[PDB]
Short mmCIF file of C-alpha atoms and ligand atoms in Angstrom, two decimals:
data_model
loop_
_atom_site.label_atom_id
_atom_site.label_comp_id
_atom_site.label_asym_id
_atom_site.label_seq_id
_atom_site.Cartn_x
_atom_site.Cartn_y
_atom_site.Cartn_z
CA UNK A 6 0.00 0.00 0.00
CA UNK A 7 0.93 3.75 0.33
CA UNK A 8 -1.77 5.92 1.35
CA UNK A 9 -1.59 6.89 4.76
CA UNK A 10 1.94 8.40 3.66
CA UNK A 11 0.00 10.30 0.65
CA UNK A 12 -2.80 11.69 3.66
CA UNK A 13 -0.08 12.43 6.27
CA UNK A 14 1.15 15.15 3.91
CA UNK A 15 -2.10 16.05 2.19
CA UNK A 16 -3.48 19.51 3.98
CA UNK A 17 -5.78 21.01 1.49
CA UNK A 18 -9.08 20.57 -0.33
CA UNK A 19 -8.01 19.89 -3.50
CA UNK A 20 -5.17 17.30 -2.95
CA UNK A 21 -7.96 15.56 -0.94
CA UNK A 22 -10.19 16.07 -3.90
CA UNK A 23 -7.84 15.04 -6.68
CA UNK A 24 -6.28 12.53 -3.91
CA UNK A 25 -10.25 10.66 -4.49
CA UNK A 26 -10.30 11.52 -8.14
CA UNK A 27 -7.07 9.08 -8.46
CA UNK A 28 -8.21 6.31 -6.37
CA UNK A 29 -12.05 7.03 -8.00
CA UNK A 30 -9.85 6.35 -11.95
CA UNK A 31 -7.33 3.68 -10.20
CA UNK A 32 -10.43 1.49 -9.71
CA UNK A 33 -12.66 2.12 -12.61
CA UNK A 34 -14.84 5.13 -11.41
CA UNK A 35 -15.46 8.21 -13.07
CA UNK A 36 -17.41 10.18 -10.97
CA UNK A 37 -16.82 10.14 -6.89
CA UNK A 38 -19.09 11.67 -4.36
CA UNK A 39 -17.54 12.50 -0.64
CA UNK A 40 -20.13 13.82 1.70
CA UNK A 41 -20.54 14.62 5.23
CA UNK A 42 -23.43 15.78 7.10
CA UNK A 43 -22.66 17.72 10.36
CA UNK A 44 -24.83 16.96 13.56
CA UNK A 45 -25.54 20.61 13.89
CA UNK A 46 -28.15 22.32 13.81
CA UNK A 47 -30.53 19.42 14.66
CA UNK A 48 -33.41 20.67 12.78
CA UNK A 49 -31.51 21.20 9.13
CA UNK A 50 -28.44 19.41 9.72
CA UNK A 51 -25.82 20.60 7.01
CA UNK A 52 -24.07 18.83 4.55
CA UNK A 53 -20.71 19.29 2.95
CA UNK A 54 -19.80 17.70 -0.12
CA UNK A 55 -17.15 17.94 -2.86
CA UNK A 56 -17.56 15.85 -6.20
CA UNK A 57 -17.05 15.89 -9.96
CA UNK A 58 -20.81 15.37 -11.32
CA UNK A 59 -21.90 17.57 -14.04
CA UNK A 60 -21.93 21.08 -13.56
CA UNK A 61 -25.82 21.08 -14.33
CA UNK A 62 -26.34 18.33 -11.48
CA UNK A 63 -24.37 19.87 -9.10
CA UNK A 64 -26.43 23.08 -9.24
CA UNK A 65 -29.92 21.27 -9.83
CA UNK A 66 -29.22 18.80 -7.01
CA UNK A 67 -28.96 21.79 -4.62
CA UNK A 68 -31.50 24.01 -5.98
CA UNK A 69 -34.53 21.25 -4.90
CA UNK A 70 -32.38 20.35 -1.44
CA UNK A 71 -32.73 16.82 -2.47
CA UNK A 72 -30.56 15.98 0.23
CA UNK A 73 -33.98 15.72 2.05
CA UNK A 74 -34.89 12.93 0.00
CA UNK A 75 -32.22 11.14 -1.57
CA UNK A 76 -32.43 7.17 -0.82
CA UNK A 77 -28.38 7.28 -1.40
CA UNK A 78 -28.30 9.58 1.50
CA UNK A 79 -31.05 8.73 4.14
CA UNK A 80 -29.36 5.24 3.81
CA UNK A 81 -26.29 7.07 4.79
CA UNK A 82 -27.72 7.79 8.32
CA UNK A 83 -29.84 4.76 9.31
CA UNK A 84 -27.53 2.31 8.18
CA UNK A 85 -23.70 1.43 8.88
CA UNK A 86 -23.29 -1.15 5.83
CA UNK A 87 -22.17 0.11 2.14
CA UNK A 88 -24.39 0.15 -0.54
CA UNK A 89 -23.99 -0.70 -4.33
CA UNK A 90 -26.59 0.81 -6.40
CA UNK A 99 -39.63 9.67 -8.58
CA UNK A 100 -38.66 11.73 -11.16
CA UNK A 101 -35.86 12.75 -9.32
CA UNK A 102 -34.22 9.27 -10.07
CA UNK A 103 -35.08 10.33 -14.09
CA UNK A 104 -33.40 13.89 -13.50
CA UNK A 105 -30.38 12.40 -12.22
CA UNK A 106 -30.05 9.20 -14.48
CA UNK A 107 -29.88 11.08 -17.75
CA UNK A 108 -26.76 12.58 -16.16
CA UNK A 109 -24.37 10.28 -16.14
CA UNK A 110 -25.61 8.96 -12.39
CA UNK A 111 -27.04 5.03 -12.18
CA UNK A 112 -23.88 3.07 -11.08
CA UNK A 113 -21.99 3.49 -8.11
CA UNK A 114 -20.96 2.28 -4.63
CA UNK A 115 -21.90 4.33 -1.27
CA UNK A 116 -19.62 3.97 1.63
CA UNK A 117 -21.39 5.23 5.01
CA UNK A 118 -18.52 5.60 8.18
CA UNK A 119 -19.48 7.54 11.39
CA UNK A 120 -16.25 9.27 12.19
CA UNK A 121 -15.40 12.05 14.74
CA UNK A 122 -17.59 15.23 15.98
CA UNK A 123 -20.36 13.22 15.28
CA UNK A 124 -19.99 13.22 11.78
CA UNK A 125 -21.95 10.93 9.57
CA UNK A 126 -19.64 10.45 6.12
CA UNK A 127 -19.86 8.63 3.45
CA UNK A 128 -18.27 7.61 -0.13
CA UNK A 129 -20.55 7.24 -2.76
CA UNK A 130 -18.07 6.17 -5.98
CA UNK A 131 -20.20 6.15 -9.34
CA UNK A 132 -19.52 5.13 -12.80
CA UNK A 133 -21.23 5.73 -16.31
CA UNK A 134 -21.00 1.96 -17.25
CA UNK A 136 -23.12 -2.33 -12.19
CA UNK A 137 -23.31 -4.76 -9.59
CA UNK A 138 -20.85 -7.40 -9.48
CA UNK A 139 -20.14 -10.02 -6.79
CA UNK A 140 -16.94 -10.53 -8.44
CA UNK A 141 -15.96 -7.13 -8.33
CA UNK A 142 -17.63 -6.31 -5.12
CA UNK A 143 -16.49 -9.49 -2.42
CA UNK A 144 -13.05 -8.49 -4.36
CA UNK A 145 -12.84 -5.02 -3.63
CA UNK A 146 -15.62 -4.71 -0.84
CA UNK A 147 -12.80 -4.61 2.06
CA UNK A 148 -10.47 -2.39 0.33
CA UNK A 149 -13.32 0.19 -0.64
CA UNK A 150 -14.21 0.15 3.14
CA UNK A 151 -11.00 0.78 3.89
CA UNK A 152 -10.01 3.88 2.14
CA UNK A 153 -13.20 5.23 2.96
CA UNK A 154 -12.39 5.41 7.12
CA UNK A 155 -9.19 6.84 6.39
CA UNK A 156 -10.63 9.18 3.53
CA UNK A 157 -13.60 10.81 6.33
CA UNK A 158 -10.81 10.66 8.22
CA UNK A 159 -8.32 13.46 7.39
CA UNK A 160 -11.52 14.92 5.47
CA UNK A 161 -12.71 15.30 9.36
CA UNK A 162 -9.19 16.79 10.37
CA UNK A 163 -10.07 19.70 7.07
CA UNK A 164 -13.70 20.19 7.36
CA UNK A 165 -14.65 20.57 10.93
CA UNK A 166 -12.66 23.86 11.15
CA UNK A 167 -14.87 25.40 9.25
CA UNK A 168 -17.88 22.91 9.67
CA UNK A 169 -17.97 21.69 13.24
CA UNK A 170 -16.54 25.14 15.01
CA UNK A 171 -16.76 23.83 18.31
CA UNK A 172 -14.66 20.83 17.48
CA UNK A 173 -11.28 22.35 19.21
CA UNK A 174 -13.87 23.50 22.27
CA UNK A 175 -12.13 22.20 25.62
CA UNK A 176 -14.25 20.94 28.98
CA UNK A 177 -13.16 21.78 31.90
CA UNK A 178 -13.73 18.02 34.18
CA UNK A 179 -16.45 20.28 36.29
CA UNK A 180 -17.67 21.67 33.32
CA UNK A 181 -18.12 18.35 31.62
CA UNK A 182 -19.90 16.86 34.81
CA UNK A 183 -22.21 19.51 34.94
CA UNK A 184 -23.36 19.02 31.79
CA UNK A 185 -24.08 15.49 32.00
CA UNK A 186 -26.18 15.70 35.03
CA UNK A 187 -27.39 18.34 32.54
CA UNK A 188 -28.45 15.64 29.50
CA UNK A 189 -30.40 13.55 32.01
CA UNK A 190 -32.73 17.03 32.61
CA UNK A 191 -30.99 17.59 36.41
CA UNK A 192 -32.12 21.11 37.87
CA UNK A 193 -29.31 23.08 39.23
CA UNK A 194 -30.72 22.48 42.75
CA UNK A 195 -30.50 18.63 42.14
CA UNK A 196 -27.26 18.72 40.71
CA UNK A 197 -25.84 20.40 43.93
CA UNK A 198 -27.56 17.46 46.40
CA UNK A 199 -25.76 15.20 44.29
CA UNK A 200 -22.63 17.18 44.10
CA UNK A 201 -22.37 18.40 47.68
CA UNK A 202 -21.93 21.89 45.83
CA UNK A 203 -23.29 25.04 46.09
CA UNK A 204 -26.20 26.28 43.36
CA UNK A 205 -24.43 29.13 41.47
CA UNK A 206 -21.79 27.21 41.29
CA UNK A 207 -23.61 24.59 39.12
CA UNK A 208 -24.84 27.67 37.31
CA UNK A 209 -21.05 29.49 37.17
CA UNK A 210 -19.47 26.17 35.33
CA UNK A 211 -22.32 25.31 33.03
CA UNK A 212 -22.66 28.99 32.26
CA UNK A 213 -18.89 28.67 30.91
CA UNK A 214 -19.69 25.40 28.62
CA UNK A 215 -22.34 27.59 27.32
CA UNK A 216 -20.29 30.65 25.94
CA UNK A 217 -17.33 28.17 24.66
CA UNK A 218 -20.00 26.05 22.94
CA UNK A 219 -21.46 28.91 21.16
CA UNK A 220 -24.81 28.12 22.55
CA UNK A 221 -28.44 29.94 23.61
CA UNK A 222 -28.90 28.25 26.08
CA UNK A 223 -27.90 24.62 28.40
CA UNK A 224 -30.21 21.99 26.44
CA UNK A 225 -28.30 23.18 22.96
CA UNK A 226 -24.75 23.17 24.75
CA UNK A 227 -25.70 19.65 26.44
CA UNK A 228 -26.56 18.31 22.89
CA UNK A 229 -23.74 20.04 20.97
CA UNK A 230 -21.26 18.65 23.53
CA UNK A 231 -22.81 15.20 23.39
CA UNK A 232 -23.19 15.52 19.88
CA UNK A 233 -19.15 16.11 19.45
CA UNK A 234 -18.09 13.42 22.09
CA UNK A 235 -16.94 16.01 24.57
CA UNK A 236 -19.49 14.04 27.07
CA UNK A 237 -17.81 10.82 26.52
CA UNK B 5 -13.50 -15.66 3.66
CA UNK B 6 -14.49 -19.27 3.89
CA UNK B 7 -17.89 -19.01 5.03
CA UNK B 8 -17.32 -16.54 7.86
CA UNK B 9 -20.76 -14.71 7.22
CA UNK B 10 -22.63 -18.45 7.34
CA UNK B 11 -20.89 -18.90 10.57
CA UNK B 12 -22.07 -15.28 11.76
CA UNK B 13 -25.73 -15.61 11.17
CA UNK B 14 -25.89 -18.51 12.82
CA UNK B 15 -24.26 -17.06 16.45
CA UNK B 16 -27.62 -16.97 18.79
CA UNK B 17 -25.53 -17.30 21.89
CA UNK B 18 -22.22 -14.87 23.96
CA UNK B 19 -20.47 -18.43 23.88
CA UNK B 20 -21.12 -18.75 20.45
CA UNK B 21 -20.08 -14.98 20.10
CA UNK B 22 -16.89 -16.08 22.19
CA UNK B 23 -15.90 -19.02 20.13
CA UNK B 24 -15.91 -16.95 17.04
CA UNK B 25 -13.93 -14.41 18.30
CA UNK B 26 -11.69 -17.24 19.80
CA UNK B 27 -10.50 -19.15 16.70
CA UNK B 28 -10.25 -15.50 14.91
CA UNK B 29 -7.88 -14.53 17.55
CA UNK B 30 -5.99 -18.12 16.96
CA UNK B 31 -6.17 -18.48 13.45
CA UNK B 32 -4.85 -14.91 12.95
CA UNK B 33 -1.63 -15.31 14.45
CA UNK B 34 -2.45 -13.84 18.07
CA UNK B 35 -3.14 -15.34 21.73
CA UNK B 36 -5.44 -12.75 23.44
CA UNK B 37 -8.56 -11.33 22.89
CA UNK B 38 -11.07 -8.77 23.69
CA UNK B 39 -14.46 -7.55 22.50
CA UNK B 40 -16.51 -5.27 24.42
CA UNK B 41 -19.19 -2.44 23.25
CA UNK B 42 -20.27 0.61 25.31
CA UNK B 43 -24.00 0.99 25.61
CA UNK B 44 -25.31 4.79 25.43
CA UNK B 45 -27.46 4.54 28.89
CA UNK B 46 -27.28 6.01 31.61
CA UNK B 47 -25.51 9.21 29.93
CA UNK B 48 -24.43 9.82 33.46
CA UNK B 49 -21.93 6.41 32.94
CA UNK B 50 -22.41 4.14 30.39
CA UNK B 51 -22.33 0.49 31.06
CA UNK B 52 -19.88 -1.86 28.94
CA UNK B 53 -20.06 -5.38 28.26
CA UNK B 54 -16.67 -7.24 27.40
CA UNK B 55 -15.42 -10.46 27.49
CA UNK B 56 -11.63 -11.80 26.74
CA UNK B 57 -9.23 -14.58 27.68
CA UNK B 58 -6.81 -12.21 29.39
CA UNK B 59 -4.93 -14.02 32.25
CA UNK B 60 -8.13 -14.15 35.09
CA UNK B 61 -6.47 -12.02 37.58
CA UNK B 62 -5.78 -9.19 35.05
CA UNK B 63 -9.85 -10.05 34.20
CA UNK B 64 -9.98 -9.45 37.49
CA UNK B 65 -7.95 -6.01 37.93
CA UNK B 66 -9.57 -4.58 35.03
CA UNK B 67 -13.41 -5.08 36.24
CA UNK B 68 -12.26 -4.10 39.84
CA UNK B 69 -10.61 -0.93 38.85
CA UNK B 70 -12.93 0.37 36.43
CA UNK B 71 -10.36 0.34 33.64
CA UNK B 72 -12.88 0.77 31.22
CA UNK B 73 -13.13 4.45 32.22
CA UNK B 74 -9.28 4.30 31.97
CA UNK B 75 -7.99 2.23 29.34
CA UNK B 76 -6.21 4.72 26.81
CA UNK B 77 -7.24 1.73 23.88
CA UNK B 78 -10.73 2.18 24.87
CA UNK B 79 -10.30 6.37 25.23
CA UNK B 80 -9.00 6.61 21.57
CA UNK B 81 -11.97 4.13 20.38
CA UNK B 82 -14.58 6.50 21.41
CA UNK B 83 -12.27 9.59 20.60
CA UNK B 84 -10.48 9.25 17.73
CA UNK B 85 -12.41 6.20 15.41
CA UNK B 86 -10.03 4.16 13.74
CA UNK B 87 -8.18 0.97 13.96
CA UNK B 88 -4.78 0.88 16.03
CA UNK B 89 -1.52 -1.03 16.45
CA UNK B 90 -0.05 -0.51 19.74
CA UNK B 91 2.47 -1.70 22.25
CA UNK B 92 2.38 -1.18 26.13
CA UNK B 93 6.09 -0.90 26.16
CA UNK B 94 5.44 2.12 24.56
CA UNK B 95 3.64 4.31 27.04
CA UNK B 96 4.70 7.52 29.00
CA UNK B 97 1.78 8.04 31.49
CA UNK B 98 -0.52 5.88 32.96
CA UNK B 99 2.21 3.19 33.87
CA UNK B 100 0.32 2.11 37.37
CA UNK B 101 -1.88 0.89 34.15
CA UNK B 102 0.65 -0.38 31.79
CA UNK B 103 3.30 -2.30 33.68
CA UNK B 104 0.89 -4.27 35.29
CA UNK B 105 -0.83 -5.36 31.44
CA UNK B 106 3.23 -6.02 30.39
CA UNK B 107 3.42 -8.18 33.58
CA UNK B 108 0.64 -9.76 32.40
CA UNK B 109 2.04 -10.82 28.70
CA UNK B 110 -0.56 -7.63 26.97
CA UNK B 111 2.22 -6.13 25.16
CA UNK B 112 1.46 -6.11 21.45
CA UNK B 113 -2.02 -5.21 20.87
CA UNK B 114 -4.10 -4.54 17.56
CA UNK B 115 -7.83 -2.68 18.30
CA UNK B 116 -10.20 -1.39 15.45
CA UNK B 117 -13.21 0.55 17.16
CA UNK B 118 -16.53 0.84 15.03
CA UNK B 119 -19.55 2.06 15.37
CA UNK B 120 -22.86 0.56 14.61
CA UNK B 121 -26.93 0.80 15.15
CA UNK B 122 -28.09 2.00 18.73
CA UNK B 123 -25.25 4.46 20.06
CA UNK B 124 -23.39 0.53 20.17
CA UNK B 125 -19.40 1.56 20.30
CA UNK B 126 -17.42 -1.26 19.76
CA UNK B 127 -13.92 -2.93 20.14
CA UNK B 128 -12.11 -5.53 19.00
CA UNK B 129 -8.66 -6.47 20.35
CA UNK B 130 -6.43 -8.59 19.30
CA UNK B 131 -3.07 -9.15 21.19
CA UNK B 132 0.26 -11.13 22.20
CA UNK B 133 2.53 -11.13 24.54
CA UNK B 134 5.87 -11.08 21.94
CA UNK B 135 6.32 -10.12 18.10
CA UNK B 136 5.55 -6.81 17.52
CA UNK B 137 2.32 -6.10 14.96
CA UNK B 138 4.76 -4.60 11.96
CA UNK B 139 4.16 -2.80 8.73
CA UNK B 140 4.06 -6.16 6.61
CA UNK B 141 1.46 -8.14 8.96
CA UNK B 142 -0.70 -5.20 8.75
CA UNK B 143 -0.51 -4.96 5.03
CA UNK B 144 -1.95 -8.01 4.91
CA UNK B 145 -4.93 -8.70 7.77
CA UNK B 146 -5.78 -5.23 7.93
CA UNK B 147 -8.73 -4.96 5.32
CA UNK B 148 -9.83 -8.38 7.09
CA UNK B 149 -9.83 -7.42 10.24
CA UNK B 150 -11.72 -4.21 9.85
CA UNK B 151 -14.61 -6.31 8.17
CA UNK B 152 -14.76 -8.87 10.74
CA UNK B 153 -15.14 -6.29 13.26
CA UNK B 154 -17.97 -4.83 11.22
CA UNK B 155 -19.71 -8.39 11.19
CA UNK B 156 -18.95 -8.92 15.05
CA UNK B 157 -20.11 -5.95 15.96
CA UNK B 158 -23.70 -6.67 14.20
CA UNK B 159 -24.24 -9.72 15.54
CA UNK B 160 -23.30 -8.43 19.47
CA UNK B 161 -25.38 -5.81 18.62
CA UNK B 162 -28.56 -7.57 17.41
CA UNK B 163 -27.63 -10.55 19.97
CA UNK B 164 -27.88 -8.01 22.82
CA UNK B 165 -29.03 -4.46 22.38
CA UNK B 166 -32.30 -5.86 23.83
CA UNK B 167 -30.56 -5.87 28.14
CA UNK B 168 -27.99 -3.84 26.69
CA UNK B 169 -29.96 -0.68 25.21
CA UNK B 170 -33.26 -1.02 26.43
CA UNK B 171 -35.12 1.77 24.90
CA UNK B 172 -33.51 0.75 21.57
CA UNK B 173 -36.97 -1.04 20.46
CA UNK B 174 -38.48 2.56 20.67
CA UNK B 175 -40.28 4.08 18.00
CA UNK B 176 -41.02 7.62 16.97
CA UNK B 177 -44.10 9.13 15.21
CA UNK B 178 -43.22 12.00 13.10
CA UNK B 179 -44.63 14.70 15.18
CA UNK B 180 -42.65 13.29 18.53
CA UNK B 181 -39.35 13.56 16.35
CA UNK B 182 -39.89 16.77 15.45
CA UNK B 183 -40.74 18.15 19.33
CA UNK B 184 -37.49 16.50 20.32
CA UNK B 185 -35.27 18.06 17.97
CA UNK B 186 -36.81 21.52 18.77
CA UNK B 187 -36.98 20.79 22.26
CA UNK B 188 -32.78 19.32 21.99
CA UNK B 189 -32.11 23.06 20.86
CA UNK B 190 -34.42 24.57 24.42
CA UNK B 191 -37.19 25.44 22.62
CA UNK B 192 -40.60 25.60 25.14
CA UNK B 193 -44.09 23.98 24.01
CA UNK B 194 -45.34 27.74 23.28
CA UNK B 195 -42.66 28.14 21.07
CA UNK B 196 -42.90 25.25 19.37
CA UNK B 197 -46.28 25.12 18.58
CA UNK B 198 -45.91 28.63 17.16
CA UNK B 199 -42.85 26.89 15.33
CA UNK B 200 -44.91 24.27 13.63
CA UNK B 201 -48.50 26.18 13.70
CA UNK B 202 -50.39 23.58 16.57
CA UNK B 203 -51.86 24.27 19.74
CA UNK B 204 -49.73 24.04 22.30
CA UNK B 205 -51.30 20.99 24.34
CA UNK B 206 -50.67 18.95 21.24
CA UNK B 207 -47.05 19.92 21.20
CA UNK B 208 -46.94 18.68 25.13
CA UNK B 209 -49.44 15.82 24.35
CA UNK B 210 -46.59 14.24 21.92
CA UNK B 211 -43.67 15.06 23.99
CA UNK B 212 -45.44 12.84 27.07
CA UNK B 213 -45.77 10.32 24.93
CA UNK B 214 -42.17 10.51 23.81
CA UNK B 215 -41.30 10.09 27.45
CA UNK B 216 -43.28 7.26 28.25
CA UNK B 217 -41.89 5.49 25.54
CA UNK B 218 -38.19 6.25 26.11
CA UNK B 219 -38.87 6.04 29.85
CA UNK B 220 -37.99 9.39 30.96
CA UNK B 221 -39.05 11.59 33.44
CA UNK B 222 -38.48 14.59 31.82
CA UNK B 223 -37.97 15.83 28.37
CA UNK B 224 -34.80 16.93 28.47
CA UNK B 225 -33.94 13.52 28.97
CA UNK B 226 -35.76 11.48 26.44
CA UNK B 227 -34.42 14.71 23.90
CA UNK B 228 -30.79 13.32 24.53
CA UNK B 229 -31.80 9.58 24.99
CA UNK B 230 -33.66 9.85 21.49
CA UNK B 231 -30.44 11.89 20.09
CA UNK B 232 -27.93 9.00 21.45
CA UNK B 233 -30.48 6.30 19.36
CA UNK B 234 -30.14 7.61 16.25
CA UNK B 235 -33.69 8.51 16.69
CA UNK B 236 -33.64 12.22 16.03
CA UNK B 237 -31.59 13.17 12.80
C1 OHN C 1 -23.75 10.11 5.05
C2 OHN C 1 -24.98 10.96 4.85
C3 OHN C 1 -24.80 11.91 3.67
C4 OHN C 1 -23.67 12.89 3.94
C5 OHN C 1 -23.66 14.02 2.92
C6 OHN C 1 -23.60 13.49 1.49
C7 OHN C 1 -23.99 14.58 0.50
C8 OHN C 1 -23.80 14.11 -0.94
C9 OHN C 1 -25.12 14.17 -1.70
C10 OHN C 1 -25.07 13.15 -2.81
O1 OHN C 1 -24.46 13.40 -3.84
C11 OHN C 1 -25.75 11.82 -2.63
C12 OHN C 1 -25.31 10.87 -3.71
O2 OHN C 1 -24.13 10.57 -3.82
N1 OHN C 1 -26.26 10.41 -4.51
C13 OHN C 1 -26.22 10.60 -5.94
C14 OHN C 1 -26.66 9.34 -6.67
C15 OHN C 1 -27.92 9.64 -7.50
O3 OHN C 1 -28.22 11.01 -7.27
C16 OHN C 1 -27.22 11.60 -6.42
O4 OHN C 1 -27.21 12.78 -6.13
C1 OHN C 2 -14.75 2.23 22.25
C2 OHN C 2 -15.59 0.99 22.39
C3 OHN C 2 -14.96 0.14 23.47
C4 OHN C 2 -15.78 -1.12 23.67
C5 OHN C 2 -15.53 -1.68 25.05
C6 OHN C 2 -14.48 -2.78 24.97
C7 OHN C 2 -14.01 -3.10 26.40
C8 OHN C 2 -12.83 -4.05 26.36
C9 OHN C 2 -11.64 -3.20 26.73
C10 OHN C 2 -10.34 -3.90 26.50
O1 OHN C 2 -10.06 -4.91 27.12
C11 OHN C 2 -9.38 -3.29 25.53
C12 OHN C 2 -7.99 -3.80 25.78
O2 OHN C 2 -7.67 -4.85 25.29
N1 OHN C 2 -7.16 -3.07 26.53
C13 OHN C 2 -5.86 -3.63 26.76
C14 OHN C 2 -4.70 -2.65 26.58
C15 OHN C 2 -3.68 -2.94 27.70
O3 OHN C 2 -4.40 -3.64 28.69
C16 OHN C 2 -5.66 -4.05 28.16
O4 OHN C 2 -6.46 -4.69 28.80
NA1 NA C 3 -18.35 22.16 0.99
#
């Protein structure tokens, strides 16, 4: 192999975009699809995705939001297993857009990622059980250091510290504790529950301690 | 693979599970094992369930002392996500840790974390007491073992999530998603039935039921029980 030694000195967009449009050629794929949807906000989480599809499907695909209904996609958050596969299915086929193979991997932040490789000229057990394990595994270390890039700008709060009291307060905090409860647990005074979730808050970038809770659960900061 | 998928579906039983794992850990060149996965609940401290063949009284140590909570292996699972090679000779800090694992023959240790349906986080370890886990060995079982670990994780997932995550059989209408994701962000009931145009006491009348089913007590809770599920998003 030699991979990890390419992505250990790759540190921009592009030579992670023309890093996938190698390995997307190197295998017999023409067009590749990286995405990633961030867990924030919850109600409209947004997704990030760089690709080579046609200019005209790039901007059509985004002018409907068909992220909100794309089978490719909504697979991509129920499920943990790849997947080789309306006249949204007719817009898209006529594009260049009916073969491919979707890689789904949770990484960090709570980011849901996944690799959807497609070709224009399917399925083959032959081809698939011989490059199922390899696809899977370029795709972890793809999301990866596309992770390490994106959640800068993506996932802001991703180089937010937590204080240990800080990290216990909101805990107490995800399992709907009152500040008065927290402190009879504690053996702690009230405002200073208050004082150290207060903190989390402002770091966090949050209205209030239900969104900071969730953000910081949502990142791993509570694990 | 030689049928390894065949031999997975079949696994109904933790001794099955442990079998499995067993020859794996044989077969492929190693003499220690672990597999483990962290369940979500209680937020306050998740629970973990793990078995291995480590030498009993280091079985022993690391239930009595709560290494779980410790363990850097188990720290960079749920932090960082991907597979590692390590060696406990290795280590700066933590030491009170490692030297007793070296004494134990866990020296040279191979762990690929995963994560699957549930808020399941899961582990497998593979390790030996001598023969370091180099460049060319890795080459070669990697891709495997990543799968495996996949297909493992599955199966203790489906085989246990029931004791393990117990609100995992939950289901959510459409409207009690959509309270809990505006109430995740602090919205109130007035403001979300403003949000979404209904009355108020229909707003509350979903979020009970929300609760019920995830077996809260309040809805801050089920919000960030429903979250760690996979429920919401
Ligand atoms: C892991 C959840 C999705 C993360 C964000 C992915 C956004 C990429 C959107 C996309 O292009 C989906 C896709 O690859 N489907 C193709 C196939 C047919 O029509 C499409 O747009
Ligand atoms: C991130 C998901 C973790 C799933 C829980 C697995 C628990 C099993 C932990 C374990 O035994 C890992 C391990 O092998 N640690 C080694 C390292 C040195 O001493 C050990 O016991
Ligand atoms: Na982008």
């Amino acid at each position: 192999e030699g991979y990890l030694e390419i992505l250990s000195r790759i540190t921009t967009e592009e030579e992670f975009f023309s890093l996938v449009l190698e390995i997307c050629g190197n295998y017999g794929f023409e067009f590749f699809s990286f995405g990633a949807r961030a867990p924030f906000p919850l109600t409209a989480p947004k997704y990030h995705f760089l690709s080579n599809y046609p200019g005209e499907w790039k901007s059509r695909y985004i002018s409907e939001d068909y992220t909100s209904i794309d089978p490719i996609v909504r697979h991509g958050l129920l499920e943990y297993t790849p997947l080789i596969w309306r006249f949204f299915w007719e817009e898209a086929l006529h594009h260049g857009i009916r073969h491919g193979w979707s890689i789904p991997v949770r990484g960090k932040y709570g980011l849901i990622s996944m690799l959807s490789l497609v070709r224009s000229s399917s399925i083959a057990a032959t081809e698939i059980l011989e490059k199922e394990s390899f696809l899977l595994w370029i795709t972890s270390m793809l999301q990866a250091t596309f992770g390490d890039l994106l959640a800068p700008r993506i996932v802001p709060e991703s180089n937010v510290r937590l204080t240990a009291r800080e990290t216990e307060m909101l805990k107490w905090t995800a399992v709907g504790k009152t500040y008065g409860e927290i402190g009879l647990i504690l053996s702690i005074d009230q405002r200073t529950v208050k004082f150290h979730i207060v903190n989390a808050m402002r770091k966090l970038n949050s209205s209030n301690k239900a969104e900071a809770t969730m953000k910081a659960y949502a990142i791993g900061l509570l694990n």
